[PDB]
């Protein structure tokens, strides 16, 4: 069949910005090419089809274009809810997709809050504390899980979620979890954050039998 290539693997611009995405078969695909968008944990969406032809729901900032082999999807007016991965599908010869191309915007700013174990969650030999860390801009941060003074470093594990449809920020939740025990061996529970959109960090705390 035909192999499809989808040149910038990752490309990021800003609302307004007019973006252009590429895909090029290893054999004249004439003009049957389709762009499917995927958007994380959803099913892909047909944006345009056989080469340049807005599906019946996709807005008009979408727009196809090409000739056997080389094709292109531009978004003339990046909005904020366009971050997704776009795959080009080629069915002239044999029915193959493309590596896809991420698309991130750009913007800037954080927001935090801490949560100790559940009466329950505790009651069964385990305590898991977990500092959240919502709608913050430069995807990179970095946390620090302390404990009176102590700073236990592991036994934590976090995620960040994807760029918002809506307000191009990430989020990041992490926990630190222990034994019920030494949980039940301190009053003090704290988590410093640290972004950029402050030099001094950020840190929220939390004391044993307090809530």
């Amino acid at each position: 069949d035909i192999k499809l290539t989808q040149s910038p693997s990752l490309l990021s611009a800003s609302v307004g910005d007019r973006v252009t995405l590429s895909c090029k078969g290893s054999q004249n695909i004439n003009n049957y090419l389709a762009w499917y968008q995927q958007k994380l944990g959803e099913a892909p969406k047909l944006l345009i089809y056989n080469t340049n032809s807005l599906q019946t729901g996709i807005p008009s900032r979408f727009s196809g274009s090409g000739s056997g082999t080389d094709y292109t999807l531009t978004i003339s007016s990046l909005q904020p809810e366009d971050v997704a991965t776009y795959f080009c599908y080629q069915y002239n010869n044999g029915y193959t997709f493309g590596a896809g191309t991420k698309l991130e915007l750009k913007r800037t700013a954080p927001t935090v809050s801490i949560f100790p174990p559940s009466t329950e969650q505790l009651a069964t030999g385990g305590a898991s504390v977990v500092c959240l860390m919502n709608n913050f801009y430069p995807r990179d941060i970095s946390v620090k899980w302390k404990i009176d003074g102590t700073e236990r470093r592991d036994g934590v594990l976090d995620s960040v979620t994807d760029q918002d449809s809506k307000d191009s920020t990430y989020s990041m939740s992490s926990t630190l979890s222990l034994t019920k025990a030494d949980y039940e061996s301190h009053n003090l529970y704290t988590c410093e954050v640290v972004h950029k959109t402050s030099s001094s960090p950020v840190v929220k705390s939390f004391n044993r039998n307090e809530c």
Binding site: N50, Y91, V160, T175, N209
Partner: protein, 218 residues
């Protein structure tokens, strides 16, 4: 008015045989085509085979040798059956509707962990301020779904009447078990007078947990 739902095991032992079931509304399997497309965990979409309107079936050479599609009009379903999995057939499998070449609708979505182990229900413990947050409009709550595997879960908040301020982060992998932690923001007004509740589901462990998520007292 076109659906396209897909049923199938959550877990399959390697070696085994995967077998899903596309169950179409809104059209006629004798006047349309349907096919299977998968998203191998850590890869891009892949078309596997296609099930013509006139019964003919075509397979992705590569995936052919072990994957075989068929349908049953009468009940309106298109079936997979892929014998001799690997660990790297894991991921969500979708079935689609097909026009002049590609697919217009279809794809409601479906996943699908193939390792050799079994299930394990989710464990839902609330998330709430240790007094702390009080008068600011605006208080964020949450609801740590822990220790479950093959894979997803899906919380909603307040029977999904919330939605903004909902914020379910991915989940990582423990001593062979998955756990997430989804959260919700919300004005202080709603989170007294009026009750906010998460509302967990893990369909490969027919789990349907619901933890209200009341204020801490200490």
């Amino acid at each position: 008015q076109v659906q396209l739902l897909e049923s199938g095991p959550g877990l399959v032992r390697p070696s085994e045989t995967l077998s899903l079931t596309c169950t179409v509304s809104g059209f006629s399997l004798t006047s349309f085509s349907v096919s299977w497309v998968r998203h191998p965990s850590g890869k891009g979409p892949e078309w596997m085979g296609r099930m013509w309107y006139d019964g003919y079936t075509a397979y992705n050479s590569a995936l052919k040798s072990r994957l075989s599609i068929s349908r049953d009009t009468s009940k309106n379903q298109v079936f997979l059956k892929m014998n001799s999995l690997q660990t790297d057939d894991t991921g969500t499998y979708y079935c689609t509707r097909d026009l002049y070449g590609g697919y217009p609708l279809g794809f409601w979505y479906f996943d699908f962990w193939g390792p050799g182990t079994m299930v394990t229900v989710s464990s839902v413990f609330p998330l709430a301020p240790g007094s702390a947050a009080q008068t600011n409009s605006m208080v964020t709550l949450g609801c740590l779904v822990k220790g479950y595997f093959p894979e997803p879960v899906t919380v909603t908040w307040n029977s999904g009447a919330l939605s903004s301020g909902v914020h379910t982060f991915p989940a990582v992998l423990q001593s062979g078990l998955y756990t997430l932690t989804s959260s919700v923001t919300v004005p202080s007004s709603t989170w007294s007078s009026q009750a906010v509740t998460c509302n967990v589901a893990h369909p490969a462990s027919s789990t349907k947990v619901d933890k209200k998520i009341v204020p801490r007292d200490c």
